[PDB]
């Protein structure tokens, strides 16, 4: 029971986050209303105080004399799904015959889509994103030729044994999901759910994954969030003897059922590494084009 007044009247424990704004339906661009000449004192729409942190509330109607315009231009193509649900390249896996990389007929790719700038720059517009995804695998030789070869793709979640060879016992794939397909077949394609332990994936994590002294040698772990590490994608040619052909597997991703939070400035310096935002300090370039004078086009 409670009796002292400050306890009865406190707000400690209020889980209802009060919201100063609410969404409205806006299937089309706003219309324009007729406006006429205004010659007033006291009324001043053109004057703002940008210091406040809000954007101007001035509209066409109050700055010039406007006609009526019934605007039926749609706002549909700028939704998150419209913008992101377009498959882009996010991974490439080589399975050469003669080589330095994966000459043993198998390969393990850590699921990380930050190795390609087009896709990466789009997702990094937001801090947190939650989505399902459709993955498509396009395979052929390095000339784009289609050969009669059978492949096996297997998803190895964190903790499952990563194959260490084309004949690894792990390919028995009794619980991991595997896909068997020919290069002659169309590109394999599957749906992937939102698998993070968190409520959303996050493209930026300003922190460390563990406790302790964060000395020089461990600084590569700054920004590492296991909540974003979904596992390994393993591929092999299905056989006990080496394949007769050199292969390449391109990985495409199409997000769907997207939600995103906290917009942020968009990358304006070339990307260097997957794991961080490092930029080349001797080549800091302006965000865009320049000119000779401010008084000349």
């Amino acid at each position: 029971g409670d009796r002292v007044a400050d306890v009865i009247e406190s707000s400690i424990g209020d889980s209802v986050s009060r919201a100063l704004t609410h969404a409205l339906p806006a299937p089309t661009g706003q219309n324009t209303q007729v406006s006429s000449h205004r010659l007033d004192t006291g009324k001043v729409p053109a004057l703002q105080a940008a210091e406040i942190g809000a954007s101007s509330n001035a509209s066409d109607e109050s700055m010039i004399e406007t006609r009526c315009v019934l605007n039926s231009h749609s706002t549909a193509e700028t939704t998150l799904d419209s913008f992101f649900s377009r498959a882009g390249l996010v991974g490439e896996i080589d399975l050469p015959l003669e080589g330095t990389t994966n000459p043993n007929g198998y390969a393990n790719w850590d699921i990380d889509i930050t190795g390609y700038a087009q896709m990466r720059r789009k997702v990094e517009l937001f801090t947190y994103m939650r989505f399902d995804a459709e993955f498509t695998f396009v395979a052929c030789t390095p000339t784009g030729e289609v050969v009669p070869q059978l492949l096996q793709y297997m998803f190895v979640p964190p903790g499952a044994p990563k194959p260490d060879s084309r004949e690894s016992l792990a390919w028995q794939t009794a619980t991991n999901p595997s896909v068997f397909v020919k290069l002659s077949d169309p590109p394999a394609q599957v749906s992937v759910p939102f698998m993070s332990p968190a409520s959303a994936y996050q493209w930026f994590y300003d922190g460390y994954p563990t406790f302790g002294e964060h000395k020089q040698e461990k600084d590569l772990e700054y920004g590492a969030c296991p909540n974003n590490m979904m596992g390994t994608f393993s591929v092999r040619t299905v056989g006990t003897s080496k394949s007769k052909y050199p292969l390449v597997v391109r990985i495409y991703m199409r997000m769907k059922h997207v939600r995103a939070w906290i917009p942020r400035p968009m990358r304006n310096q070339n990307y260097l590494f997957k794991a961080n935002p490092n930029y080349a300090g001797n080549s800091i370039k302006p965000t865009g084009a320049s000119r000779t004078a401010i008084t000349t086009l």
Partner: protein, 245 residues
């Protein structure tokens, strides 16, 4: 009547006679974690007045050549007062913040600071200049504590992103001819209901001059910028011994 303001929380009161309203980040107020968003089962502790109060942590000097600074939250407070102690004794922490950046001058000085809050402010390095070296920022740069840290390349916010777009984040400007402070209220921002006040910095506070400070010889040249901040709705769980990192 929008230029004047009083902020009272805990045993602390702030006054200002040249304000520019108040910004409530992403349009929502701080709140305690609900029973359905929560996952941890221990009953939390909500110290209230002893930790949700204003702490004045640091003062920087604004000079005609200053490049700008940043601080990390909740890092700036992990070693201060009762808030710091709870942050150290507990694994889990969550709270919001009321940030009040102070900077006053005279009607003959000029200059404008951009005061902004950027969630998950990951810092990058110049990569050995040539960009061929995968160097990483040291602990004192990612979590600078109360003293903050000075930006090396403000134009790209030391992270390869344009400061020109920083206004997409909750902000206010301190333009000397207009106001002498910025006030921003920030709710808890994360993909989890609670997290470590030690290993994770939810957002960074950036104070960057965009229009350089200027004044004529004879006017007071020492123009401080002071940082005061208050935790709001602080909650802690997962009790054990105190740990500093």
């Amino acid at each position: 009547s929008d230029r004047v303001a009083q902020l009272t929380i805990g045993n602390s009161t702030i006054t200002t006679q040249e304000a520019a309203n108040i910004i409530v980040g992403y349009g929502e107020w701080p709140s305690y974690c609900s029973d359905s968003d929560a996952t941890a089962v221990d009953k939390p502790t909500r110290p209230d007045v002893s930790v949700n109060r204003f702490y004045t942590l640091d003062t920087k000097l604004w000079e005609k050549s200053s490049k700008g600074w940043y601080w990390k939250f909740p890092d700036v407070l992990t070693e201060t007062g009762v808030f710091g102690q709870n942050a150290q004794f507990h694994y889990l922490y969550r709270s919001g913040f009321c940030i009040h950046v102070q900077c006053n001058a005279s009607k003959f000085h000029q200059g404008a600071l951009l005061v902004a809050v950027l969630p998950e402010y990951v810092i990058g390095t110049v990569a050995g200049g040539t960009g061929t070296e995968d160097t990483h920022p040291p602990y004192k740069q990612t979590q600078p504590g109360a003293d903050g840290f000075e930006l090396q390349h403000p134009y790209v916010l030391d992270a390869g992103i344009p400061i020109s777009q920083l206004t997409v984040c909750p902000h206010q400007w301190i333009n000397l001819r207009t106001n002498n402070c910025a006030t921003i209220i920030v709710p808890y921002i994360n993909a989890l209901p609670f997290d470590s006040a030690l290993n994770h910095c939810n957002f960074g506070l950036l104070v960057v001059p965009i229009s350089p400070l200027d004044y004529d010889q004879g006017a007071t040249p020492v123009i401080p910028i002071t940082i005061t901040l208050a935790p709001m709705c602080s909650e802690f769980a997962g009790l054990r011994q105190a740990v500093t990192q």
